[PDB]
Each structure stands twice: as C-alpha cells, then as structure tokens.
Model the fold of this input.
Amino acid sequence: GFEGGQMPLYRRLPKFGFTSRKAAITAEIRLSDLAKVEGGVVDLNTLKAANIIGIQIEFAKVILAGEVTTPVTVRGLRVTKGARAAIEAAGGKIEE
Amino acid sequence: GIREKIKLVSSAGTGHFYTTTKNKRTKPEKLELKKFDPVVRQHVIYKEAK
Amino acid sequence: PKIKTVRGAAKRFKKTGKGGFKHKHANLRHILTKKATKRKRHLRPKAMVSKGDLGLVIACLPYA
Amino acid sequence: RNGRDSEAKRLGVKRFGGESVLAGSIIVRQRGTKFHAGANVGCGRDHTLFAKADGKVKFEVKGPKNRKFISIEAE
RNA sequence: CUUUAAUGUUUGAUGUUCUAACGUUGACCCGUAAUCCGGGUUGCGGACAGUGUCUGGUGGGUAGUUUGACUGGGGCGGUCUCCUCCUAAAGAGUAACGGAGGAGCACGAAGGUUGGCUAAUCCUGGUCGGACAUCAGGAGGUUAGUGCAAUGGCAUAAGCCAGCUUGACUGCGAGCGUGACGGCGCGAGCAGGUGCGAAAGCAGGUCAUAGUGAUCCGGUGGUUCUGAAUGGAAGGGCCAUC
RNA sequence: AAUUCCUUGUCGGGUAAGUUCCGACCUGCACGAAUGGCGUAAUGAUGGCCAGGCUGUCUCCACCCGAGACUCAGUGAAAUUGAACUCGCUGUGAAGAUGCAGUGUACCCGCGGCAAGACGGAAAGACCCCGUGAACCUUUACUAUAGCUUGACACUGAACA
RNA sequence: GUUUAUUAAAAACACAGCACUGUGCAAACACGAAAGUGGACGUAUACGGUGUGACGCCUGCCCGGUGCCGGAAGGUUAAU
RNA sequence: UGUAACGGGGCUAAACCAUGCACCGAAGCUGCGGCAGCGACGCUUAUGCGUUGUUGGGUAGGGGAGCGUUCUGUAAGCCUG
RNA sequence: AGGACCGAACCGACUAAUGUUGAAAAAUUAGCGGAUGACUUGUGGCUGGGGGUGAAAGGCCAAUCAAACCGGGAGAUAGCU
RNA sequence: UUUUGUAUAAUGGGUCAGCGACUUAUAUUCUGUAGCAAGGUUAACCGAAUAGGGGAGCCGAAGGGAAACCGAGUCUUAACU
RNA sequence: CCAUAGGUUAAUGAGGCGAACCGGGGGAACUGAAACAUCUAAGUACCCCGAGGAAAAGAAAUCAACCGAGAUUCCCCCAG
Done:
C-alpha cells in the first residue's frame, strides 16, 4: 500500500466501527447438523460435545441452512423463523 | 470570510439542528426559520442565530 | 514468519460475501455546513472498493 | 504573469441524433442553453439536458428565434 | 443570626536569642617512626551551607536532525490549488518559465412562488439645473442588465418591481456524465411534511461554470448499539457537527 | 591606499617610451581611531620600484671537459594491452575516422631520433548537477541535554517577644 | 623567535607593553558521576579569561538593537 | 591539410524535357524440397494422415518445450585390466 | 652585558636545478636562516579519540587526521553504477 | 553494457584455467496435479515408531449490519414503488 | 578511667582459567519510517557481576465467572 508518495487508499479513507466482543462467542448452527448431536436434544453442550461449536461459545442459533429430518428437541438456543418452521415440520420440538 | 457559522436549533424537544452561516455584523437579529424536524417529523420553528 | 496484516487497513475495509471490500466514504468528517445535503446523504452508505484498488487492499489484508 | 488555466469540463453532446437512451441519461452537458429542452427532455440546474423518458434523441430547430430543441421520440 | 468585648485555649506568620543535628581544605592528642583517613578534645560557622527528588529560567557548551520541487545546467527571479477564454487541428481530451484574466466569497434576501414590467444611448421641450441629477415626448433596439473574471446563456426573461413566504426541507433514488482511484456532478420519480398559486403546477438554494482541504487526533449535542463477573458508569460506535 | 568599481583617475618625478614605482590632489563605489588611527630608528631567506657593478639571461649561440644516450659482453624490469594483415585526403557517421564511401599513395623488415595523432598511459573528473547521500562547521533553524541558576519537600531544631 | 612533518615561512602566530573583566582563598577557572588534583605550598604588586600588540603623538561621538551589570515597585509566571 | 558541391573515370549527351518498348534489380512474389505453430474438417477416438487454410523479424517481458552436469533410489544389477 | 655581530659542529629549510616507473613513499647538489638561547640533544616519564596537544596550521597524535588504529554491531544502508 | 542512437574516439575485458550471482525458511494467494468430498485435514505429543493413535484446532458449507440483533435474507429509513 | 579502634598469632575459606547455555547491573547506533525528532532497530550488539550442571521460576494476596480450575517451566493452537 505504497502509491509513490500519494496518500494511500488505506489511509485517505476513514475508519469505521468497533469489534463486538460478543460476536466471538455467538455461533450459527445449520440444520444439516443437529442430526449429528447424538441424542435428539440440543443445548450448548450436546453441541460442544459433538465438536460443532467450540468451547468458548456461549450463544448459538439454529439458522435454516438445510434439511433436518429426525425429530429434534431444541433447548435454550435461539432459532430463526424459517428454521422454527422446519424443525417443527419434521416432527421436532422447540422449547426455551 | 467574515460570515460566521450558526446552529438553527429546533423548538421541539429534540436536539436536532440545522447549520448555516450568518453575517453577524450587518444582521445582529436572531434568525427564525420554520424548518423540518425529522425526529418529530413536522415543520417546527428554529431559532439560534449563534 | 507469518504475514502481518496492515493493521490500519483492517480498520477501514471490511470483506463481503463475494470477496469484495466495503469501505466508508471519505469527505464526511468535518467541514460540513458548506456541503449540500445531497452530497452528505450520498456519502453515508458504505461503498465497494473499485477494481483498481483491490490489488492494494488484498495485499494489505491477507487474512480478510 | 501567466501560466494558468482551469481543468477542462468535458461539455458537449453525449448522445447524438437517433441514439437510443434510457430515462435519466444526460444528452448535452453544456453551459448556457445553447440547446433547449424539447419533448420528454428536462433541463437540469446547470443547463444539463437529460432524457426524461426512454426513446431516441431528436435534434430540432423550432420557433421564431430558430432555437435548437432536443426532443425524445417514444421508442 | 449580625456585630463586638474580656479570658482561657487551639494553630500558623515574623524578628531576635540559643545549642544540640550538619560543615570545617582552624589548633592540639591518638592509631602512627604518616600534610591520607578515622577517632578524641576544642574553636569557628550553624538550620545556613551542601547534597537528593520535583520544578521554572538560561543553555550551539554538547548532541540528533531539517533546510521542497518545477527549472530549456543549477542559482537568483517566478510558479505550485481552483475558475474563464485562446493555443486546441469543427466530439472529448491535449503541452511549454505560451498569450490574457479571475477566485480563496457574498446573500435570510440577492433563496421559493405568484402577479406585473422592460433596457443603454442620443435628440427635442422644460424652474433653480450645469456636458451629465428630476419631468414629458420621440428615435433606438438590448449597443443594457445579470452581487464579483471571462465564456456560453437569458424576453416565456436567467434582467427589473411588488405580495406571501422558508423547498437554503428529511429519508431515498431509475438512470447517466466524469475521473487511475480518492472523489466530483446531473437527475425524473417514491415516501413524509411544507410554501406560493384559483388552478395546471413550481420549489431539495442562487443564470451556469470558481469561493477550497483527505485521513488521524480530538471538542460539542443526540441515540442503552456496545459496555471485559454482574448493575451502572468511563471509553468506544452510529447520526449531526466543529 | 594590502582598501578606489569607473580606472592605465588627474597633475608631477624617474624612462626614448612606465597599466607597475615615488610625490601630490581628494569626486573615501566601499579608511578611520585598542576586531586600534597615524608616524616609526633598527630588523626581515618579507612585498613593490630604481641605479652602480657584473655577467651566455639575451642579441645568438660556439667550442671544450666529464656522466648518460649509441655499439659489444653479462644480468635483466615497468606502466599498457578486445583482436589486428595498425597509410594520406575529401566526405559520411553517436555530429573531430588506421578500420565506412570515393580516391590517392605505398616492395618486405629493422636501427637512431622527434613527439602531430592514436579524443595516448596514470587516477569509477576534485568543477557542475543529481541522491528525500555523508561528514565536520555556524547561528536569534527545530528538538533535546550537560552546566549554571530559581523555589518546594527531605536531611532539619529550640527559646522568647 | 613560531607555523601548514611531505607544494604556503608570510603581512599570519607569538611577543614585551596596554586595557577591560572575573577572582577574598575551600579563590575564580579547569580535569574529574565523586574523591581528589592543577590554579599554588601562590593571596589582588596575585591568579584566570578576553582583546590590542615595542616605542612616539593619540584614541572622537552613539546605550535605540544584542550582551553584561545593577534595581526592586507593579504586570505575568513552575513545582506545591 | 588535398582535386574535394556528379561517389570516381569520363560525358556535349553518358544532361534536361516528352513519349514508348525492353532489360537489370531485394531475404518482396513465384517454383521445387524441408521443419514448426494455430485454426477448420472425415476418420483416426487416447492421434496421425489423404487433408486443408494460414502463420513463423523481434528488445523489455509473458507463455511452452527440452539438453547437459553432480548427487540419491532402481543398483550386491549392468559395463570395466 | 646581550632572546648582541660574523661563522663551523648542531638545529633548520629560503631559492634554483636534478630526481619525479627516484639512489630516496620528500631526497641530492649549489647557494640559504639560526647558531648562549623563547636554543639544541640523549635517556626515562605523563596526556588518548569528540579526547589529547597545539607561539593556531584544522597542525600533529606510528608514511593514516574537519575526528587515529584494531575488532565488533555488520551481509549498515545504497530509489545509484 | 548503457542508450533516442555506438565501428564509435562512450564503459569493460592482456590471455588461459579454476571459482563467481534469483537461494533458504516460514506464512498468504493463484495455476497444474493427486486424494477425499458437504466435507477436507490434523499440530504438539504418545509411538510396535515415515505405521497407527492424537480432530486441540484450522478451512468450507450463510450472509447482512458499526453493533445489539436478524437470518436466505439483512441494512438504510417513520416505511420503502 | 572501664572500653572500642588498632596490633600479633593460629584455624578454615576464597583468589585464577574456561566454549556455549542461565540470572542480574548497565546499554548503543547504523537501519526502517521511502526525509526525521515520538516510534523502530532493541533491552539486540557490547561492557560488567554472579552461579550451576543446568540456571531461573514456583506452591495463588492466580485466573475465571456465578460454572469452575488449581504451583512453576517447555511445546502446538488461540492468532497476526
């Protein structure tokens, strides 16, 4: 990033934002998993135990990203709208 | 040049201000303009020629 | 070694969904009462880094 | 005592006759109203003439002063 | 409570006096057959001087450095950003220490709209009144005017006068122009709220093109968006802005 | 005038003839009183000018004596060097030709000698410019700092007004 | 007399002499983180610094600038 | 410095002008032979040819394909008094 | 008597010529200055690198001096050749 | 070799012979190729030790937003043709 | 004056060398920032003291986070 002496692009443009601290401990669970949890019950542990979120993770969310089949009981995780419909449509149960 | 910068503050409870420039010397009177307040969403009187 | 990020570039560009980089527009920090509101309103949303400059940005940001 | 000039402003006719335009397209960026606005053409604040409807650019000469209008034929 | 009077008491300030800390490159004694040093006696000075940390001043004594580019070699002079015309070869662009000029603002009306109006100059007549101040008539045609250069515009006036006003709005924006980029410009239309007009409509500043300065750092107002155990807060972000 | 640009100022002395020299004038571009002014006997491997003597300095060189130079015997370097079968002129040409073009001249090879050319040899031009090079030097450049200096606290107390 | 050893011996440096200024002795000043040492086993007729440079006749005016010396009233002024 | 302003000899045409027909003239074009690249195309299909068209000056530079050297495995093999 | 005079040793170095791949990384030859003094010399000692020493030239400090030599940082850096 | 341009009278080289200059490590990106594939892969280490364990982790399958948050959507905005 | 300082003798120990590693006391600059001063280089080079076969550190006035872990040291992640 040296343009001759002209003020470089990364230094003539302003800086924005901040880093959250909390987005580093949120996660994002698909529906392709949660057939992988060994139990048919989904909490933060039961996902950590299945090597699927990570140990530092405190918050998780159950995004519609494809094809849940078995009846799964989701516990204590936020679930999106479309994926609430997809978990409840394929048997399933969501309590919080 | 000589022409200063002022804040037209809103007469409603908001902090919203327009900003502009006034010749302080020739027009020492305050400047009242019924401008638009987007927090109230209504045309309110604005005051404060700084 | 491991490649160091040009650190003040990470504060200014952010990666998008298809590899492009977004950035905040210049010219909207101070001297502002002289500018039309049409300028300022068109400088608030964030913008993509153009074709010319992606080389530089990718060089400065090798992990993002 | 000399040695200065401004930057060239890139005026002139951007879309010529018969050239198909979208709405919003600038036709003649110019300085006074050398070319006047005709049918489906607007005149901007700096006398920029822009296509207000889609179609084809039509340069004409109208009126008692022989002014040079720019219409747009609906197309 | 205000204001004062005596006593006791509680503390600071200043000056004189004192011996007890420290100084002694005064004398004598001892370690010691030694002009160092230490110890002892004594004299003088004495809370000073001196040294430590903190702090203002001075400080080429010393150190680290800086001291632009263009340039018909360099220096000297001039220039460096922006606007207008010409060069510029009838699209755009186009250079030279080529030829000429300007800007670094102004304006709450000189902006918006509605209604109206039309200049310069010359001739003739007419109190003071004059080559030229007002009046009336004629010729004339925009040779005028346009807040400030020049060019292009302007009568449907973009020029001139009056009424009401704040659209010199807020969020957006199909589409374009223009730049290597940063950026800059034009924009019908959509939503909210407004002004003028009977209405069609017009209004997101000014006839247009100059009137300017990235980022960082930081200041002020708003918004729990964040807020390192937790509740706040500090700080940060975002919006406005200096 | 160690100072005077104009300037070889002007006048005078010396000379046949004197931009220098001596004396004077003063219109001192731009002397001047301890960064001393003006005089000054003696001194000076000091600067400038004049004269006597003396002379090969010179007119203008000549001869001689020695040491090399030259020849023979012995020993035996050096810088330089892309390769060479290494001429003149006129022109062309990266613009000053042994090598190109045209032409002229020239059997092959040495020895003594001269130095016009080989943009000859020696030394990555010392001048000039450039480098966001260096070094030392300066200062009322910038920033520091040693030193000097100021006050507070410490070491550091009493007894009376 | 001295000087550029190795292109400059000079009008330059030095000098006796003059002046200004500092210095009261544990002197100023210098070398030294300090101790100490030189100044000097000296004491203002001495010592240090600076300029001028035998001798003769002399050394004129300017204190606004920069420095130095002196003053303490007022303004501004650090740590605390 | 030497003719020294046609390259030279030399030319009164071997100069100039006009017309015309010849011929010379290059690594240009053609003929014959060979090699290589990129297309197209019927097979061959993992590619070669009856083909076929066309291309092949090259600096900075980019792309493709190779030769040699020394060392390790194949190699207690294979050459070698 | 004398930083007195002339002049050898002794100290120096003013001029010229030679030398300049030297006899010599500063000399030789012919003249030249001082030569009882601020002289000269032997032996030992002391002062050291932003430091010494300097009758001052930026001179001298081991043929090196506008900052010695050796070793190290160190393959400094070199938009230049 | 450097150049707009060198027989150049611009640079370099007396000649020969030997040595003499794009490397190595670790990250990141793209191309080729190989394995596996909505999955790929382990590092340190244990070690019958180039095996096998070791999935801690990294990369990918989900984005938008400064962030909370939302999520095949999201941000802007009171709301978006 | 008592006594301390001092003196004499005896016993035990030390002293010096050594390549790297280790702890501590001091501590640059070239360089990079396309100049340079904050910054970098870098607590590196170097100097000095000390010790051992290793040294150092070390047994929570430590994290964590309303769950828990349990001294120090080293390696791979975390994570450029």
Remarks:
- Chain B is about 0% helix and 50% strand.
- Chain B has one domain: 1-50.
- The domain at 1-50 of chain B is CATH 2.20.28.120 (Rubrerythrin, domain 2).
- The first strand of chain B starts at residue 4 and ends at 10.
